[PDB]
Ligand binder design. Sequence first.
Ligand SMILES: O[C@@H]1[C@@H](O)[C@H](O[C@@H]2CO[C@@H](O[C@@H]3CO[C@@H](O)[C@H](O)[C@H]3O)[C@H](O)[C@H]2O)OC[C@H]1O
Ligand SMILES: [Ca+2]
Length: 513
Amino acid sequence: MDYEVVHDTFEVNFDGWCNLGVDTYLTAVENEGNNGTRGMMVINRSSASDGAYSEKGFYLDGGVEYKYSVFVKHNGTGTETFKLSVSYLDSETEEENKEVIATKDVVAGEWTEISAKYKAPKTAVNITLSITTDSTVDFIFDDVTITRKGYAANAVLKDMYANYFRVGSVLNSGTVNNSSIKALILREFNSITCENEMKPDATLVQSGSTNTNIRVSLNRAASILNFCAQNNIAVRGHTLVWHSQTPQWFFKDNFQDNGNWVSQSVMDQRLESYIKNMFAEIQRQYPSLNLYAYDVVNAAVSDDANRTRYYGGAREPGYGNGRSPWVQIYGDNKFIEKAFTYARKYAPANCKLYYNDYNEYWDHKRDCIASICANLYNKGLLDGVGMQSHINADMNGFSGIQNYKAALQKYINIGCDVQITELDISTENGKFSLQQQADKYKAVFQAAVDINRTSSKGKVTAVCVWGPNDANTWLGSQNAPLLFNANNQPKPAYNAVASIIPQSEWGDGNNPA
Ligand SMILES: O[C@@H]1[C@@H](O)[C@H](O[C@@H]2CO[C@@H](O[C@@H]3CO[C@@H](O)[C@H](O)[C@H]3O)[C@H](O)[C@H]2O)OC[C@H]1O
Ligand SMILES: [Ca+2]
């Protein structure tokens, strides 16, 4: 058992560990760790199955044997039976099986090692270590260890663009288990956004929320944040307010999907609380994470010209289908400035606040987004406009290079920054070739680089692609819309984008400027 694949020694961050059981609480405390170090306390359990867990899919493969080892300590009376358990999901049967791998009776007051060798089936993905007891006893663990068993800049995006902006991609619960993508991200990208795991419905906790204390959870995001903090990859938060992927109950008097719409002043409380508590938890659990940007409000301007003309861009009130529960409560887009105010209040200083939207180069919508953002920038509330940049491969037309530069320029002319937040470039089911997609990718990065070489005030501080490869895109792979194919081989677009910056100007991707 040579290689060490995991070593969690909670000195800085929670290292990807979550509370098992909706009411269990994890708290990392100084000096309560093994050897006087920082340790991880698990409290408030209410059944032998409650406890703590960590998805380690990033680090553990199916069909491989590992030695799993954790030091634990409890402060009760007599012996406690500790259990280490491993869970996976069978990529065939789609069932979660959890087998207890080590059972060990542990005396009070003493740091003890619990460990065993375990080899999960060849078809196991999402391998998850969890610690529990045979009682509902409180405990503390430290020094989790899993083992087996067998500046010159590189030609990589983050290094090539180190003097210009971060270069981002996206991770999700599924891709976080893909070894091959882990290697890709580490090699190329210095920014990650969670595709879904930081949205309101992935983070809000219904049980026990109240108007002035909305409970939140990073359990869905934790392996990602952990992976990013551990490897010095910056993260964009996505997203605090959005008419989509937000539970209806969040908007209802009794925290139930079918309650009554709440008043504006009730919803102010809940809005502020969600925002305060999201920032508090990120700080609490991943203080070393470079949370460089956050999408405070997402996609609030309507695609409908009638609404941008006569209703300040408000979507239609309601829930689902592009309707907005925010407009349902507030009547209006006034909630936007509210969200940025609370975000300015609780975000770290280095965390830049973005209004993010798509079809951002369509005149009537562009004009409305630019106006909203300029008013916010001027009040000190907003730092940047996010251009989602869900575009196609056509140099001409609705998202062609002209419309796109015009929008990039009008955003930059506000004085704020710009980020290109969710870039993908659809071939429209093969209507456009990979060679034309390469041209559009080259045009877009080239336009960002040009802004940065020109002026001044405004900059493009990130360019991010909405996915790591063509096997993992929300547009479906028939639109092959990213820089790497389904085997992570670089496409023509990658070659193209890698050819814009001369070797002399490359810098340190881990310390971009
Ligand atoms: O059924 C749910 C899926 O539909 C959901 O898929 C995600 C939908 O949101 C996508 O990302 C957005 C794309 O558009 C921009 O306007 C937004 O700012 C982005 O958030 C995301 O890529 C999809 O994966 O997730 C899984 C299901 O529960
Ligand atoms: Ca420790």
